[PDB]
C-alpha cells in the first residue's frame, strides 16, 4: 500500500536526478574535487575547464553565468519530466494536464531541490564539479546579483528541516501533483491523485520524523513559499529578457514562463 508508493517514488527520484542530497553532502564534506569559484579569476578558470565550448571565442561574465543557470534548469526540467512519468498515476492523465502540471511545478521543484546543493557559503554547480560562492553571486552587477540570494534564503530554512532524499522525493511529487494549477482539464482526478500523494507524504513524515510533530504543515507552508518564490523569480527573468539583449532565453524555458504568472 502506502509504504510501497513512498518507496516507488523514492526509487524514481534516485534513478532520474543526477544530484541527490547524499551525493551532494559527500562532495561538500571534502576524486573529481569541486573547483571553487569565488572571484572573476576563478570563474574564468572554471569556465575553461568545465564549460570550455562556452568561452572558446565573449559577453559579460554575468551573462555567461546566467546562460549556465538556464542550462542547469533545462537539464533539471528534463529530469523532472522523467520523474513525473514514473509517479504512479501521472501517465494516466490527459497529456494536456501533464504539460500544465509540469509547467507550473518544475521551478517550485527546482528551487526545493537546489537546497540540497546549497550551504550558507555557496552551492554546487556543473554536475558537482564546481562550487560557486554566495558572496561572488552577490557581487555580480545588477540585476544578475538578485537571482540567487532569495533561493539561498529559502534553502537555509529548508535545510534546517533536516529532510532526507526519501522525504524530498515525496515533497517533489506533491509539488507536481497539484490540482489548483491554472488551466487543468480534469481537476477532480488530479485532486484525487494529489490527495493520494499528500497522504503518503503525511504518513512518511510521521514515520521518518517522529521528533517533529509539525513537519507536515511546515512542508505545506514551504510549498506555498515556493509558489511565491517562483512568481518573483519569473518577474525578474522578464526584466532580464527585456533589458539584457545578450541574455537570450532557452526555448524550453520560454515555453515554461510564457503565460505562467
Amino acid at each position: 500500500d502506502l509504504k510501497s508508493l513512498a518507496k516507488r517514488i523514492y526509487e524514481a527520484y534516485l534513478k532520474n536526478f543526477n544530484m541527490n542530497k547524499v551525493k551532494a553532502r559527500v562532495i561538500l564534506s571534502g576524486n573529481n574535487p569541486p573547483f571553487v569559484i569565488h572571484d572573476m579569476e576563478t570563474l574564468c578558470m572554471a569556465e575553461k575547464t568545465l564549460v570550455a565550448k562556452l568561452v572558446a571565442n565573449n559577453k559579460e561574465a554575468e551573462v555567461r553565468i546566467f546562460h549556465c543557470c538556464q542550462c542547469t534548469s533545462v537539464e533539471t526540467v528534463t529530469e523532472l519530466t522523467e520523474f513525473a512519468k514514473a509517479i504512479p498515476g501521472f501517465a494516466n492523465l490527459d497529456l494536456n494536464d501533464q504539460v500544465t502540471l509540469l509547467k507550473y511545478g518544475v521551478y517550485e521543484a527546482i528551487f526545493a531541490m537546489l537546497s540540497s546543493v546549497m550551504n550558507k557559503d555557496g552551492m554546487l554547480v556543473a554536475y558537482g564539479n564546481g562550487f560557486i560562492t554566495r558572496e561572488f553571486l552577490k557581487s555580480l552587477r545588477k540585476p544578475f546579483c538578485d537571482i540567487m540570494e532569495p533561493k539561498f534564503d529559502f534553502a537555509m530554512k529548508f535545510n534546517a528541516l533536516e529532510l532526507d532524499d526519501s522525504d524530498i522525493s515525496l515533497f517533489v511529487a506533491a509539488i507536481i501533483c497539484c490540482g489548483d494549477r491554472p488551466g487543468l482539464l480534469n481537476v477532480g482526478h488530479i485532486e484525487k491523485m494529489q490527495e493520494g500523494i499528500v497522504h503518503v507524504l503525511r504518513l512518511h513524515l510521521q514515520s521518518n520524523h517522529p521528533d517533529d510533530i509539525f513537519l507536515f504543515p511546515k512542508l505545506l507552508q514551504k510549498m506555498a513559499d515556493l509558489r511565491q518564490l517562483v512568481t518573483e523569480h519569473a518577474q525578474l527573468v522578464q526584466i532580464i529578457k527585456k533589458t539584457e539583449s545578450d541574455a537570450a532565453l532557452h526555448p524550453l524555458l520560454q515555453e515554461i514562463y510564457r503565460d505562467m504568472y
Partner: peptide, 10 residues
Amino acid sequence: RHKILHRLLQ
C-alpha cells in the same frame, strides 16, 4: 503551445 514539453512527455 508547449511542444518541447509535450515531446519530452513522450
